Structure 1
Amino acid sequence: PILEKFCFTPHTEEGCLSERAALQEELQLCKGLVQALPSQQELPRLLSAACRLQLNGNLQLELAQVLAQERPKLPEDPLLSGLLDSPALKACLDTAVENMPSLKMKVVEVLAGHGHLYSRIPGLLSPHPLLQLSYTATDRHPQALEAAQAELQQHDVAQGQWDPADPAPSALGSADLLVCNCAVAALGDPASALSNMVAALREGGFLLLHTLLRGHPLGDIVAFLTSTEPQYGQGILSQDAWESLFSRVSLRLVGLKKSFYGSTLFLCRRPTPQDSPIFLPVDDTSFRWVESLKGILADEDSSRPVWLKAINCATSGVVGLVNCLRREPGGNRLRCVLLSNLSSTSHVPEVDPGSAELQKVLQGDLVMNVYRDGAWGAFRHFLLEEDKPEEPTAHAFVSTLTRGDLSSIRWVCSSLRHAQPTCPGAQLCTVYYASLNFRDIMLATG
């Protein structure tokens, strides 16, 4: 079985990966080498080699090229690929998937040679039971990405030749989602690349971009390095600079995930032709609104979006209702807004049409919009850890979890946590030494 959890994910998370200790240690090591101009990780090795040849006046060429760094192992560096090892990417992909008119998704990756997202996106979408995916990889040059062709073959991916600098070939054409991985792959120019990409992106589609923000410690540290390649320095920009650049191409930002060390994951959506939006309160306990909604949905000719909003109660089930309706004919127009606050102290915002919050969510134009304790996000699914939980106990017993395999023997909690000492027939006794008989070996062996 596919075991998951169903929690509430804000569309904007900052300081995402603070919990991890290894990332902080890597950051401390990296700045330490930077200070005054040591680990198996590739990026610290590169920094150490750069500082090794000269303490002052380091040559750009010597640090640019060195043994053990020519390989595209920079993405493998935990600091650089931190966000793609966390559930932020899963949340972004799920948000992209949900706001799709149909059940099929068209995802095209730019600079697939270095981005390496081709080996992580396809697996993350396996849990969805009905979704059908069309992943296509692309690179500036053919020979690039020629390696790992078996990896591309084991999944279903399509080769390409597009260089984001030039207009996208019509073969890719309009696409549901675009992924770049600007952290490692080199972008020729921000404005030109984004213009070509937004041109490629279909209407209402999404663009997911991973980049290392400038102005943050790791951003500056990488900026000093790679100085030989001006392109790689073009991808590194400022958060406000990125936001401004987005406004130029009339591409709107729906979500953003910011690592504690600077990395960020921009999710953007292509605006759609404006239409007058319908509204229908769904908090009436008499379910009289069902007739109202049934009346609206009947006129399939109309293309006016429907915005089912409930603000009176925090236990409304608008989420399931919109999830199920969207499959039904005419469901593409349905959209939701729920105010589900769990803390009584939290103030309830105003959802009146004049208010700003409704305007911002409408500009976002997402199917799900759930407000809980000062955040706007949607409930999302994640895989849960594989370990069997363990708790400190005074009563436990040994058991072969998988019959026949002695390797599966482990301690488990025992019913004896609940017992009565008064009864003489109980005589619950502690155990200091337990013997093993032939019968026990026969049982464990199966």
Structure 2
Amino acid sequence: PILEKFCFTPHTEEGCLSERAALQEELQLCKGLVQALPSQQELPRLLSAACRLQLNGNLQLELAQVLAQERPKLPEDPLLSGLLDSPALKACLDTAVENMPSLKMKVVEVLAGHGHLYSRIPGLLSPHPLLQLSYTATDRHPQALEAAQAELQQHDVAQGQWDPADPAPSALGSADLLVCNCAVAALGDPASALSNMVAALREGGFLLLHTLLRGHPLGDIVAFLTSTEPQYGQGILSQDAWESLFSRVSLRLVGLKKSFYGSTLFLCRRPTPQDSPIFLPVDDTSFRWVESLKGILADEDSSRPVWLKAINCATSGVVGLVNCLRREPGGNRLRCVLLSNLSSTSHVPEVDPGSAELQKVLQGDLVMNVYRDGAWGAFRHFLLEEDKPEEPTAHAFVSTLTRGDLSSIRWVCSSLRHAQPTCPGAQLCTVYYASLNFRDIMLATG
């Protein structure tokens, strides 16, 4: 079985990978080497080699080219690929998936040769049972990405020749999702690439772009290095710079994921033709709103968006309602708004049409809109840790977890925690030494 958990994930979150240590130690290492102009990790090795040739006046050429760094291992470095493996990417991909009119998704990766997301995006969507994915990889040059062709084959991916500098080919046409990974890919310029992509994107589609922000320590570090290839150097900008850049190409920032060191994962949606929305209370206990929605949904001609907003009861299950209705005829028009605080102390935001919050959420046009203790987000599915839980206990027995496998003998908690000492016949005893008879071996061996 596929085991998953259902937790509230905010659209905007910062300091994603703070809890991680290895990343923190890596950042400490990197900054020191940068200071005044040591590990197996690739980026520390690159910095150490760059400084090794000279303590001052290093030649951009020599630091640009060096053995063990010519390979595209920069994405393999944890610092550059922190969020990618972190649960933020799953949240962003699921967000893109849910707000899709149909059950089919068309996603195109730009600069896949160095982005290498093609090895990660297809596998992450295995849980979804009814989802069909049309994945394809487009790069500036054919020879690029010539490696891993078998890896591409094992996943439903197809080739491409797009260089984001040029207009997007008709063969891609309009795609549901555009995934970039600009951090390791070399974008010639932000503006032109964003224009070409947003042109390539269907109405209401999504654009997942990963970039290393400037103004943060690692940002400055990468700015100093990677200077020889300006295209890579151009990719680094400021968070305000990126946000201002989007507006120029008419792209709305649905979600943001900012790491503790500077790396950020962006999700954007191409705006859709505005229309006057229908508002329908869903809080009545009498369930008298079923008729109202029934009439609103039934009309085939009507194409307006319909919003089911609950603001009184935090326990309203409007989320499940919209999840089911979206698969019924005419369900493509449903969109939810739910205010479920778990703490009475926190307030409840106003949602009147005049109120700013309703205007912002309407601009987002997201299907799911849940408020919880000062944050707008939606519930998501995450795989839980595979490891089995353990606790410190004083009563435990030796059990063969998988029958017939001596490699699976491990301690398990015992029922002897719930016992009575009063009964003379019970006589609970502490075990100092226990023996093994031939019967035990026969049993464990199966």
Q: TM-score, normalised by structure 1?
A: 1.00
Cα displacement (A) at 1:420: 0.1
Q: Deviations over 1:258-293 (max 9, x none)?
A: 000000011000000011000000000000000000
Cα displacement (A) at 1:19: 0.2
Cα displacement (A) at 1:147: 0.3
Name the CA distance, whole Å, in 2 between partners of 1:274 and 1:154.
Answer: 41
Cα displacement (A) at 1:344: 0.6
Q: Deviations over 1:98-155 (max 9, x none)?
A: 0000000000000000000000000000000100000000110000000010000011
Cα displacement (A) at 1:16: 0.4
Name the CA distance, whole Å, in 2 between partners of 1:29 and 1:416.
Answer: 50
Name the CA distance, whole Å, in 2 between partners of 1:234 and 1:291.
Answer: 56
Cα displacement (A) at 1:186: 0.2
Name the CA distance, whole Å, in 1 between partners of 2:145 and 2:219.
Answer: 26
Cα displacement (A) at 1:97: 0.1
Name the CA distance, whole Å, in 1 between partners of 2:425 and 2:246.
Answer: 77
Cα displacement (A) at 1:445: 0.2
Match of 2:182 in 1: 182
Cα displacement (A) at 1:233: 1.1
Q: Deviations over 1:380-406 (max 9, x none)?
A: 000000000000000000000001000
Match of 1:326 in 2: 326
Name the CA distance, whole Å, in 1 between partners of 2:71 and 2:126.
Answer: 30
Name the CA distance, whole Å, in 2 between partners of 1:300 and 1:96.
Answer: 26
Name the CA distance, whole Å, in 2 between partners of 1:366 and 1:234.
Answer: 32
Name the CA distance, whole Å, in 2 between partners of 1:415 and 1:301.
Answer: 64
Q: TM-score, normalised by structure 2?
A: 1.00
Match of 1:71 in 2: 71
Name the CA distance, whole Å, in 1 between partners of 2:298 and 2:442.
Answer: 68
Cα displacement (A) at 1:256: 0.3
Cα displacement (A) at 1:442: 0.1
Name the CA distance, whole Å, in 1 between partners of 2:313 and 2:359.
Answer: 22
Name the CA distance, whole Å, in 2 between partners of 1:191 and 1:225.
Answer: 23
Name the CA distance, whole Å, in 1 between partners of 2:197 and 2:42.
Answer: 31
Cα displacement (A) at 1:62: 0.5
Name the CA distance, whole Å, in 1 between partners of 2:275 and 2:351.
Answer: 19
Unaligned runs of 5+ in 1: none
Q: Deviations over 1:318-372 (max 9, x none)?
A: 0000000000000010000000000110011000000000000000000000000
Cα displacement (A) at 1:307: 0.2
Q: Deviations over 1:200-235 (max 9, x none)?
A: 010000000000000100000000001101111111
Give the 3-state SS of the residue equivalent to 1:291 in structure 2.
helix
RMSD: 0.3
Q: Deviations over 1:60-95 (max 9, x none)?
A: 000000000000000000000000111100000000
Unaligned runs of 5+ in 2: none
Name the CA distance, whole Å, in 2 between partners of 1:313 and 1:234.
Answer: 49
Stretches of 4+ aligned residues off by more than 3 angstroms? none
Match of 2:239 in 1: 239
Name the CA distance, whole Å, in 2 between partners of 1:347 and 1:370.
Answer: 14
Cα displacement (A) at 1:300: 1.2
Name the CA distance, whole Å, in 1 between partners of 2:422 and 2:134.
Answer: 68
- Aligned positions of 1:143-154 closer than 5 A: 143-154=143-154
Cα displacement (A) at 1:49: 0.1
Match of 2:252 in 1: 252
Name the CA distance, whole Å, in 2 between partners of 1:319 and 1:298.
Answer: 20
Name the CA distance, whole Å, in 1 between partners of 2:439 and 2:225.
Answer: 66
Give the 3-state SS of the residue equivalent to 1:108 in structure 2.
strand
Name the CA distance, whole Å, in 2 between partners of 1:224 and 1:247.
Answer: 28
Match of 1:3 in 2: 3
2:213 matches 1:194 = no
Name the CA distance, whole Å, in 2 between partners of 1:426 and 1:45.
Answer: 65
2:363 matches 1:378 = no
Name the CA distance, whole Å, in 2 between partners of 1:127 and 1:315.
Answer: 27
Name the CA distance, whole Å, in 2 between partners of 1:220 and 1:259.
Answer: 15
Cα displacement (A) at 1:176: 0.2
Name the CA distance, whole Å, in 2 between partners of 1:7 and 1:233.
Answer: 38
Give the 3-state SS of the residue equivalent to 1:75 in structure 2.
helix
Cα displacement (A) at 1:167: 0.2
Name the CA distance, whole Å, in 2 between partners of 1:222 and 1:276.
Answer: 47
Cα displacement (A) at 1:294: 0.3
Name the CA distance, whole Å, in 1 between partners of 2:376 and 2:165.
Answer: 35
Give the 3-state SS of the residue equivalent to 2:170 in structure 1.
coil
Give the 3-state SS of the residue equivalent to 2:320 in structure 1.
helix
Name the CA distance, whole Å, in 2 between partners of 1:176 and 1:35.
Answer: 44
Name the CA distance, whole Å, in 1 between partners of 2:352 and 2:250.
Answer: 26
- Aligned positions of 1:108-119 closer than 5 A: 108-119=108-119
Q: Deviations over 1:43-66 (max 9, x none)?
A: 000000000000000000000000
Give the 3-state SS of the residue equivalent to 1:44 in structure 2.
helix
Name the CA distance, whole Å, in 2 between partners of 1:301 and 1:40.
Answer: 63
Q: Deviations over 1:24-48 (max 9, x none)?
A: 0000000010000000000000000
Instruction: Report the identity percentage.
Output: 100
Name the CA distance, whole Å, in 2 between partners of 1:234 and 1:255.
Answer: 23
Give the 3-state SS of the residue equivalent to 2:76 in structure 1.
coil
Match of 2:101 in 1: 101
Name the CA distance, whole Å, in 2 between partners of 1:90 and 1:346.
Answer: 29
Name the CA distance, whole Å, in 2 between partners of 1:74 and 1:222.
Answer: 11
Name the CA distance, whole Å, in 2 between partners of 1:79 and 1:224.
Answer: 16
